Design a protein around this ligand. Structure first.
Ligand SMILES: *C/C=C(C)/C=C/C=C(C)/C=C/C1=C(C)CCCC1(C)C
Length: 227
């Protein structure tokens, strides 16, 4: 096939793969129980992303949805990735500030809606309805970010400054990266179709790699992960 976005798919596969192995090797050396906990969640994140970037690289996770008078290329393998990677990143942040079980359940549920309605939207054939679903997904995301900024940050204050300060960074990198996804979807292939797929794939890999491997490096190199 040789689609124009494959080079970006091959770069995301490489970065995710390398990041997985570094975390894995660093994780099986640590003896601390809590550290092990964080290491196992943070290594699984880029491991799932790697398998999906690799599948997309190989021609899977791609479907042609009809709307706007075109046969539009929608990479659904992405939501198969995010359906398990977003709630896992939320768990890393939840365990860090000692969030409650109700909070975690509500954040994971919200994340499920966000990705579910997102895909339903990327698959919808009525152009205007694609944006109705997009709208609900975004509203779910704003709920998650609100909790992370108002809820979590507040409970991270019962932690030590080292733990509170690591959370602020992970919390900030998350608020900045996550807010970007809905905009890329809106002006990209799933939405307006203003930004071409090849460029769109490049934006997503920079966001995906930063949000997982970038997030993992910051978190796993900190002492806040220790029991
Ligand atoms: C490793 C992947 C990460 C951290 C992905 C985060 C993805 C989002 C915050 C995605 C959000 C979306 C919306 C708000 C609405 C439209 C569709 C999505 C799923 C692209």
């Amino acid at each position: 096939t040789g689609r124009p976005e494959w080079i970006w798919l091959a770069l995301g596969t490489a970065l995710m793969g390398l990041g997985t192995l570094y975390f894995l090797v660093k994780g099986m050396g640590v003896s601390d129980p809590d550290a092990k906990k964080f290491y196992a969640i943070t290594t699984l994140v880029p491991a799932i992303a790697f398998t999906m970037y690799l599948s997309m690289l190989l021609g899977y996770g791609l479907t042609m949805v009809p709307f706007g008078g075109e046969q539009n290329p929608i990479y659904w393998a992405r939501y198969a990735d995010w359906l398990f990677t977003t709630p896992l990143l939320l768990l890393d942040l939840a365990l860090l500030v000692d969030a409650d079980q109700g909070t975690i359940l509500a954040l994971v549920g919200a994340a499920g809606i966000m990705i579910g309605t997102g895909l339903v939207g990327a698959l919808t054939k009525v152009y205007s309805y694609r944006f109705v679903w997009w709208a609900i997904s975004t509203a779910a995301m704003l709920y998650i970010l609100y909790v992370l900024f108002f809820g979590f940050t507040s409970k991270a204050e019962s932690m030590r400054p080292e733990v509170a300060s690591t959370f602020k960074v992970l919390r900030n990198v998350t608020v900045v990266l996550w807010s970007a996804y809905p905009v890329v979807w809106l002006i990209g292939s799933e939405g307006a179709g203003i930004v071409p797929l090849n460029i769109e794939t490049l934006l997503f890999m920079v966001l995906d790699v930063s949000a997982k491997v970038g997030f993992g490096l910051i978190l796993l190199r900190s002492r806040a992960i220790f029991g």
